[PDB]
Amino acid sequence: PQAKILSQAPTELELQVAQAFVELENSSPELKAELRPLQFKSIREIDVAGGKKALAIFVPVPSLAGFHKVQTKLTRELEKKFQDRHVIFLAERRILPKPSRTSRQVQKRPRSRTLTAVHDKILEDLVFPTEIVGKRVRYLVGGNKIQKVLLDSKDVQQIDYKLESFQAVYNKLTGKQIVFEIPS
RNA sequence: CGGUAAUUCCAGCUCCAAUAGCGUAUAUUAAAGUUGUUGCAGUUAAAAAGCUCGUAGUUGAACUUUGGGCCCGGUUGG
DSSP, X not given: OXXXXXXXXXXXXXXXXXXXXXXXXXXXXXHHXXXXXXXXXXXXXXXXXXXXXXXXXXXXXXXXXXXXXXXXXXXXXXXXXXXXXXXXXEEEOOOOOOXXXXXOOOSOOOGGGSHHHHHHHHHHHHTTTSOEEEEEXXXXXXSOEEEEEEEXXXXXXXXXXXXHHHHHHHHHHHSOOEEEEOOO
């Protein structure tokens, strides 16, 4: 089972979570149907303030639309089984380097593989249930940048307590500071 | 400027400027932001074409690897 729900089974933490999938799939006749085709590729643990950790789960991008039907419940369940964790799902995306004037030619680089485009999609996935309603960028006199992301005040209670963990996760993946705000 | 009564003509004194050199004519440069790339002007002083379309010419919005770590590291100053 486990090596057939992982796209590879190299390490034990994925085996723990893989088991939880198999367990939960039995506990309800509903999940027995929905969860069966899903798979995930890798997991990374990122430490954050207050001693907690983020379970960043990486998913094949053509299947991402499936998880969005089951991402609720799954977060409820997994945060019980792995006590003191925050769980978030991310699609894996390529990024291709920018061509130099010296390089030999290759097929034209699709715009979705640019670095700017990929980082925007990452941020969209973190806050998944809510929509982003705007962005700001601040250029401080010290010579450094901060982004502010504004969230739709809808169902925010599902993520309202996680925001500090999102800041830490995003920094690890990119090196960029962000803060979250919720317009009334 | 000069028609008597001359600070301007003519002469005599005195004085000034450059000086082995000084003056005149013609051309050209600066002065000239009176040819304007730097850098002009066009209500009333010279100068916006009766009006619109349109080829050559001149000109044309934004976007694609950014940021963060670790070594070596030359020059100058204390």
